[PDB]
Paper text:
The Gag polyprotein, composed of MA, CA, SP1, NC, SP2, and P6 domains, is the sole viral component needed for the assembly and release of an immature virus particle, which is accomplished by the oligomerization of Gag into a lattice structure at the plasma membrane.
BVM is known to stabilize the CA-SP1 six-helix bundle and prevent the final proteolytic cleavage of the Gag polyprotein, thereby preventing the proper maturation of HIV-1. This led to accurate positioning of the BVM model consistent with the “up-orientation,” where the dimethyl-succinate group is oriented up towards the CA_CTD_. However, the location of the bound BVM is more distant from the IP6 binding site and closer to the SP1 region than previous structural studies proposed. Another distinct difference observed in the *in situ* structures is the altered shape of the density for IP6 upon BVM binding. Interestingly, the density for residue K227 suggests potential alternative side chain conformations (**[Fig fig4]**), where K227 can potentially either interact with the succinyl moiety of BVM or engage the phosphate of IP6.
Numbering used by the authors:
A (entry chain C), B (entry chain B), C (entry chain A), D (entry chain D), E (entry chain P): 12 to 85, 97 to 242
């Protein structure tokens, strides 16, 4: 048999990790899995890195599809057999080669396509550019979330360092941003966190309130 | 057979604690665990202390690889048998030294290497130096977290006391920092907490607002 | 036979592309591919996407090692047979399971390790951060190089758009930088290229020389 | 045998010409060639007009895929047999209709999809809108490049004349653009080339430098 | 038979690496390889790392000597047999132990000595001390050449870093040297490259010409 070659599987993983879950991944999946066995489709789906929530919804949709097949359809393959959960590779090969054919691979591909369509319909891909500090969020938690996303980000080490240099100070709230810009660019992460530790405390609130009242009093 | 030695295990634990989960763990592990029965691998993994979340991820990854082996591969070892959970030492050695050999230890090493690579990729070590105080965080909760982290980390007692003296006051927000500096160095922990209890309350906030207003009025 | 797994190969590709050719590539290759046939090693080598020059030198190093093996060593494996070029999986499996065994996979792995060590020794990765306009380079050639590198760069589309927004004007030469800065942030790529189309022509050089001489005369 | 109809082939050529090597050609290629004999796939690939570099890229990718097939897989078809080079239509039809079937057409389609995906990943189309004069390029070579691109462009004669009237003067460098604008709309191509013959010569540089210094002196 | 020991081969490699291709290479090669078979001589020749051009000339000289031997002379050894390309170790041992002996190793050593003498005659080794920036060379190209030579240079990492901080700015052209000196020792490679990116452009030319003319006018 001609299963999924490593090149095809790696191209699938690359296209998924490059285009996230955009609609354009739906055609690519169908093209790279023509004639694929249900076990081959399961291997195709199981090698996706990240996107745990999307894979969870895809598995849930596959489960609903299998339940629907079990309800409508009373050896004869079942929903789990088509999905490959309880089915040997030899059984699938026999099913797709027996006369008359039972395209278990085609049915599984249809179910996976339905799940992919739903995901693409309501997905929302996170990114390092979408990590910004809240109006009242502490700077330490902002740095924690930013670095977690950066570690989850897909880029080279130098590009990640450039992201750290730029977006960390770019995407902070004005209260922390004014303090951060009041410091020199040479300031490292520890100094920035120490400077922004005070933001939100009673002392910082009193200081900003006093500055505002002094400015408005001097204006009038 | 020749199983793992106490010095081998001690060196493994020592490097794990020293480098936490630095990438150098990946080679060094493969410099000790090679040629070992998967039971020795399980002992190697379980002997470690701390990093419970990382060990949970590592176990989860081995579970995923065992499920993958059970799916692709239909006595012949199963995924749990290779993982060592449901395989005894005798049949384990028999599998290792069979004709043809079934490298159960090699496959378990590959799974553990995959899990360690994931951990190295997305895990950030926690240290006492990273424990600071939030802008609204009460001082008592800060001290509790500080002491919990201090007890968690390994060091000699003299270094622990030096850290307590030099870091607890230093890694505090300006509101607590001002009160702490206004107190004498001879002040103990109970005195420090008592003097810092009022921070964040109504009286302290009113007092700081009063100083800010007085400074503004005196300036102009 | 238990050949390589899709997850292991995916992880190998992931580490190769994430770390480029950092030294950390050598241990991981020694962990994922340890115990594999020469065909599996060839698959892992050929599957790696990008870095055409580095894979070329790896092929040259493997060829040199095979030639040395042929020169020293007079069915008995040859250099090409060990490298997998002129051998089948059945022949290799028989070789590593013969009495006495002939570790063809081990020798091929050693050759690949030597090649990877040489690459890590003298290979310098390229990145979009290293694309800077020359002092005499036309702006359009710089833009073409920048966009080619961006297309070759491993990043998400949003990150690539951010790179286009920032680095393209950030890495331009001062003569083009002045014009781009005077253009304003709202300028598009076509307008930016039109504005810098004359940098280096007789008119621009005459203008800048006249400005410099006017500054000198006004100073005097 | 139901081969590829002329309408399907011409539609494939039309979408390739109109959409270029945009992503939307992967879905279209799969839809029009679903069930195609490898000879039919080669006919679709060869009929594409233009895009010599991209077609060569696809040929190299198909060659690498055939080499991979030959390496992994020991009448039994070979890589060139799947690619359709060393195989007749009768042999491929018999392979498709054999028991068990050998989907050589599906494998060739997968290889072509892989090559198309790589091309779409890194291809960049060229158009007459991208033909601009360099800051030091002589006007005549710019006109030659512009007319070569215009001849290679797919458009009507009147549209091509309109772009000749507009873009040729629009996309010239500032030094030539000033002269062309001062010439007049009535000026033909020969007069335009004659007026821009001196751009870059000693006389033109002396003239522009003199004008710049005269402006500077008059300003002072 | 007593072949060449690893210590002798390592000493030969160290001598070549530390003396480059000084005349003292000839005596040491005559002392370490005295009595070696052509296979051992080929091992020492091919093992030498670096100096690709020198080894190419040595191979060319060996080929010329082999051609001369084939022309002058009518199993009976041949030129390639003396060079070890065609002959095996058993044949070489038989020739050296035949009555009368045929010292093919001695002839091959003479050919290698002739090649080494030619190399020592006309070979000039490159060093990081000879990497100087051209009068019109861009700074980034000079940096690339310097770093490639440094990577090829035999030294420790700390010494290489010291070379980076000293020679890179020490061996820059005066136009770039002035800007680098005006920057300061605190500047890193990125800031230095950004500052020197404008050297050799209309703005920099206008600036330096204006400075010189202002100096002349002030002097007058
Ligand atoms: C301010 C002054 C004190 C004096 C008072 C008035 C003045 C005079 O009466 O003397 C009018 C003439 C000028 C403006 C000088 C200043 C200097 C200049 C200059 C020397 C400037 C540098 C320029 O050099 C290049 O452009 C050379 C190169 C780049 C290689 C190229 O060929 O393009 C050239 C073109 C050679 C000019 C010639 C015109 C003069 C003499 C003025």
């Amino acid at each position: 048999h001609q299963a999924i070659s490593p090149r095809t599987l790696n191209a699938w993983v690359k296209v998924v990790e490059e285009k996230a879950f955009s609609p354009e991944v739906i055609p690519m999946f169908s093209a790279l899995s023509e004639g694929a066995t249900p076990q081959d489709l399961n291997t195709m789906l199981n090698t996706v890195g990240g996107h745990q929530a999307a894979m969870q919804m895809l598995k849930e949709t596959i489960n609903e599809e299998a339940a629907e097949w079990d309800r409508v359809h009373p050896r004869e393959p079942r929903g789990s057999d088509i999905a490959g959960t309880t089915s040997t590779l030899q059984e699938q090969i026999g099913w797709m080669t027996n006369n008359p054919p039972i395209p278990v691979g085609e049915i599984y591909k249809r179910w996976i396509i339905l799940g992919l369509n739903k995901i693409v319909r309501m997905y929302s891909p996170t990114s390092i550019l979408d990590i910004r500090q809240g109006p009242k969020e502490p700077f330490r938690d902002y740095v924690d979330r930013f670095y977690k996303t950066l570690r989850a980000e897909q880029a080279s080490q130098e590009v990640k360092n450039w992201m750290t240099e730029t977006l960390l100070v770019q995407n902070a709230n004005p209260d922390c941003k004014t303090i951060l810009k009041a410091l020199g660019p040479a300031a490292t992460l520890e100094e920035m966190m120490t400077a922004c530790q005070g933001v939100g405390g009673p002392g910082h609130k009193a200081r900003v309130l006093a500055e505002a009242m002094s400015q408005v009093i001097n204006s009038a």
